[PDB]
């Protein structure tokens, strides 16, 4: 029982660390790509200008 | 700060904790060449 | 937690274990599935120059006796944790400075690293300075830094 | 006081504003964090908090997390609560043609005519958040945006 | 032990992986040595009939030095100082301004066979006969370089 | 001179043909699976 419970310990801790870190950094990338999209917006804006 | 300091600490402690075993990674480039070439072939095909 | 890695490095991609089995096959000149004094002292000597220091007994003493394929894999498995491939680090370095040119000024670098977050000493932070190649005039490039942090690049060769 | 959830929020802000030593808190730091944590009234509360107009030493303005908690309560008793009707009437009096043709210059003028002013980078920063054109807003959109925090 | 080793040196990085594939495909039993039973019966699969005992003769050249690692050592031992064909292509193109494989047969004769290195005419006739002759009787130094490097073809069985 | 130093030197090996001795079918093993990707890469490069 203690073997299996610490097995779930390791498995769930590793999976939660990976998933949450990827999620937070993927929202960081979300903001970054939104920023690049808005730079392309100002590029089209200056072409129109 | 959390993510990057964690990664930096993990690499800097292991930069010489297992330096030798990290230095036998030379044949990794030689053995990854087939997969890398196949992949790069794929992306250059899509860039064509 | 326990950090014993009961499973055989299950919390990672499996490509690296094909590279590890290729490395195991090429080191195992005996090809019996186990490392040996006979194995390493000549396969390391293939690129090395027959070192006098007995650190291959360092390996066979770190894990007593000849080590199994799975033993080698798990003793590398305990060496990987809290790290991720180059994509996320590159994205973060793109995030923190908008220009993304990798002009991490030395004062800016130390302010962003040592000061906030988990408190740690700038003296141990200096290992990132005396060893890692910093760009001149204060700014610090990251793409080469990311490559050397990963397996993409190395500072020198034997 | 509420449950320990607000104490936990204050604790995580305490470890968040840990520069130059986590333990000590600057009154500037505590004022900023208390404002941002849902308390607008911050202008004249320095005298109501310190009890001493002394504002000469930036390095050492003593405050501790212990007495910080009742300070938050005696601020959060909501000594003043205005609503947009007074704000919009003041701006429409400040308005010129009832629609806001070009409001950019005069808003800057009216904010630089006030004695108690602190920042100009915020004055150039306010263009963000739908305040993009030459004062195109009739102030309703910007009032709605500011009254959303 | 197997007791085989030598001083290692790289000759063609883009070739060892193909060499390791060749070693793996011949070594069905994963032995690392060279075996008459392993190869001859496998050679006869796609080949016609390599039953002549030149194979046992060639595995009898040296007593038990065979291994995967030494397969590089022997080849490097045979051949050293090799240059890519494209730079060699430029070297061939140095004397002739056309540089389109139109090197004249008499041009090559008069230059190489006599002036410079004084040798027999036979040591060029094997290139004259074994290799194809370009149009008009020229020296197609493009496909000539290709067959110097990899394009040399013979009985494939 | 730099042409002569290496051309006949390889062609001297062609008179030795040690590689031929055990790989008379060396082009056959060269055209098993890898020739497809070398041809694809060469065609992609020349078309680009
Ligand atoms: Mg062994
Ligand atoms: Mg075999």
UniProtKB/Swiss-Prot annotation, chain A:
Species, as recorded: Gallus gallus
Family: Belongs to the TRAFAC class myosin-kinesin ATPase superfamily. Myosin family.
Segment of the intact protein contained: 1546 to 1594 of 1979
Subcellular location: Cytoplasm, Myofibril
Superkingdom in the source lineage: Eukaryota
Function in brief: Muscle contraction.
Subunit structure: Muscle myosin is a hexameric protein that consists of 2 heavy chain subunits (MHC), 2 alkali light chain subunits (MLC) and 2 regulatory light chain subunits (MLC-2).
Protein's recorded name: Myosin-11
Domain description: The rodlike tail sequence is highly repetitive, showing cycles of a 28-residue repeat pattern composed of 4 heptapeptides, characteristic for alpha-helical coiled coils.
UniProtKB/Swiss-Prot annotation, chain D:
Gene Ontology annotations for the cellular component aspect, listed alphabetically: actomyosin; cytosol; muscle myosin complex; myosin II complex; myosin II filament
Residue intervals passing through the bilayer: none
SUPFAM superfamilies in the cross-refs: EF-hand (SSF47473)
Coiled-coil segments on the chain, per record: none
InterPro entries (alphabetical): CALM/Myosin/TropC-like, EF-hand-dom_pair, EF_hand_dom
GO molecular function, a single term: microfilament motor activity
Entry keyword annotation includes Acetylation: yes
Domain EF-hand: 5-40, 82-117, 117-149
Keywords: Acetylation, Motor protein, Muscle protein, Myosin, Repeat
GO biological process, one term: actomyosin structure organization
Function: Regulatory light chain of myosin. Does not bind calcium.
SUBUNIT field: Myosin is a hexamer of 2 heavy chains and 4 light chains.
Name of the featured protein: Myosin light polypeptide 6
Organism of this sequence: Gallus gallus
Native organism taxonomy: Eukaryota, Metazoa, Chordata, Craniata, Vertebrata
Protein encoded by which gene: MYL6
Curated annotation (Swiss-Prot), chain E:
GO molecular function: calcium ion binding; myosin heavy chain binding; myosin II binding; structural constituent of muscle
Span of domain EF-hand: 14-49, 83-118, 119-154
Calcium is among the record's keywords: yes
Keywords carried by this UniProt record: Acetylation, Calcium, Metal-binding, Motor protein, Muscle protein, Myosin, Repeat
SUPFAM superfamilies, alphabetized: EF-hand
Superkingdom field: Eukaryota
Protein residues bound to Ca(2+): 27, 29, 31, 38
GO biological-process terms attached to the record: myofibril assembly
Function: Myosin regulatory subunit that plays an important role in regulation of both smooth muscle and nonmuscle cell contractile activity. Implicated in cytokinesis, receptor capping, and cell locomotion.
Protein name in the entry: Myosin regulatory light chain 2, smooth muscle major isoform
Natural source organism: Gallus gallus
């Amino acid at each position: 029982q203690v073997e299996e419970m610490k097995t779930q310990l390791e498995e769930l801790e590793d999976e939660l660390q990976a998933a949450e870190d990827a999620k937070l950094r993927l929202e960081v990338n979300m903001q970054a790509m939104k920023s690049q999209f808005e730079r392309d917006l100002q590029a089209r804006d200056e072409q129109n200008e | 700060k959390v993510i990057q300091r964690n990664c930096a600490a993990y690499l800097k402690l292991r930069n010489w904790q297992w330096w030798r075993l990290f230095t036998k990674v030379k044949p990794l480039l030689q053995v990854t060449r087939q997969e890398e070439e196949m992949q790069a072939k794929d992306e250059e095909l899509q860039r064509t | 937690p326990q950090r014993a890695t009961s499973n055989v490095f299950a919390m990672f991609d499996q490509s690296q274990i094909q590279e590890f089995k290729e490395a195991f096959n090429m080191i195992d000149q005996n090809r019996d599935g186990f490392i040996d004094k006979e194995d390493l002292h000549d396969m390391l000597a293939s690129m090395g120059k027959n070192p006098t220091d007995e650190y291959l007994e360092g390996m066979m003493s770190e894990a007593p006796g000849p080590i199994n394929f799975t033993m080698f894999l798990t003793m590398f498995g305990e060496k990987l944790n809290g790290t991720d491939p180059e994509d996320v680090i590159r994205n973060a370095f793109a995030c923190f400075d908008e220009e993304a040119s990798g002009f991490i000024h030395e004062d800016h670098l130390r302010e962003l690293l040592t000061t906030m977050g988990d408190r740690f000493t700038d003296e141990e932070v200096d290992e990132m300075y005396r060893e890692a190649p910093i760009d001149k005039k204060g700014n610090f490039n990251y793409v080469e830094f990311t490559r050397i942090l990963k397996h993409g690049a190395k500072d020198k060769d034997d | 006081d509420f449950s320990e959830e607000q104490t936990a929020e204050f604790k995580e802000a305490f470890q968040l504003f840990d520069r130059t030593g986590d333990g000590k808190i600057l009154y500037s730091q505590c004022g900023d964090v208390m404002r941002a944590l849902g308390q607008n009234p911050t202008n004249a509360e320095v005298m109501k908090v310190l009890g001493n107009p002394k504002s000469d030493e930036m390095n050492l303005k003593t405050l501790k997390f212990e007495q910080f908690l009742p300070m938050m309560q005696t601020i959060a008793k909501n000594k003043d609560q205005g609503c947009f009707e007074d704000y919009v009437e003041g701006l429409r009096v400040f308005d010129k043609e009832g629609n806001g043709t070009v409001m950019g210059a005069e808003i800057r003028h009216v904010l630089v005519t006030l004695g108690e002013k602190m920042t100009e980078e915020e004055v150039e920063q306010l263009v963000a958040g739908h305040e993009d054109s030459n004062g195109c807003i009739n102030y309703e959109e910007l009032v709605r945006m500011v009254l959303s925090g």
